[PDB]
RNA sequence: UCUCGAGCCCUAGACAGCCGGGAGGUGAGCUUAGAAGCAGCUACCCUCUAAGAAAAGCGUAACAGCUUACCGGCCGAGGUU
């Protein structure tokens, strides 16, 4: 449950809002 | 292209060589504006988008030679 | 080779392998005719960014070149101490 993977998903979601698995994760949110 | 940093500094700085040990031996100084100009001459050699960052790049070679700022 | 235990990592993809990326300021400053990761001394900072040392090991007269770090992909189950 690494913290950097969590900060990433949020970072990604912040760009979509305005690693493939992390992208999917974000897209799924 | 445009000449390197090490030199563009030793010009407006008014000195020829650096310091055997930087940050410990401040050889020269450079006003913020002076650094704003150099950053303008290297716009092509630097990757930064804004002038702000371009500075951080230049403002990174000085303090490492005893080139304080004001 | 068999058996028992502890720590840590892992399907938010672990360990290994293979492929791709490994970038700019800048070939840092000093010393030196020259030294550009890599003779020696000191410092070891910030841009772009998903990464990429002021360079861990070879290599060169010095470059070049080949790779480690680091990032991404393929793969898919335990792996490592």
UniProtKB/Swiss-Prot annotation, chain A:
Has been called L10e and L10E in this organism; in this case 'e/E' is for E.coli-like, not eukaryotic-type protein. Belongs to the universal ribosomal protein uL10 family. This is Large ribosomal subunit protein uL10. The lineage of its organism: Archaea, Methanobacteriati, Methanobacteriota, Stenosarchaea group, Halobacteria. Part of the 50S ribosomal subunit. Forms part of the ribosomal stalk which helps the ribosome interact with GTP-bound translation factors. Forms a heptameric L10(L12)2(L12)2(L12)2 complex, where L10 forms an elongated spine to which the L12 dimers bind in a sequential fashion. Forms part of the ribosomal stalk, playing a central role in the interaction of the ribosome with GTP-bound translation factors.
């Amino acid at each position: 449950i690494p913290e950097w993977k969590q900060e990433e998903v949020d970072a990604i979601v912040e760009m979509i809002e305005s690693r493939n698995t992390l992208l999917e994760r974000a897209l799924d949110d | 292209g445009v000449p390197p940093t090490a030199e563009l500094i030793k010009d407006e700085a008014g000195f020829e060589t650096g310091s055997g040990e930087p940050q410990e031996d401040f050889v020269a100084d450079l006003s913020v504006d002076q650094v704003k100009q150099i950053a303008e001459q290297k716009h092509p050699d630097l990757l930064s988008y804004d002038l702000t960052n371009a500075a951080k790049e230049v403002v990174g070679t000085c303090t490492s030679l005893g080139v304080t700022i004001e």
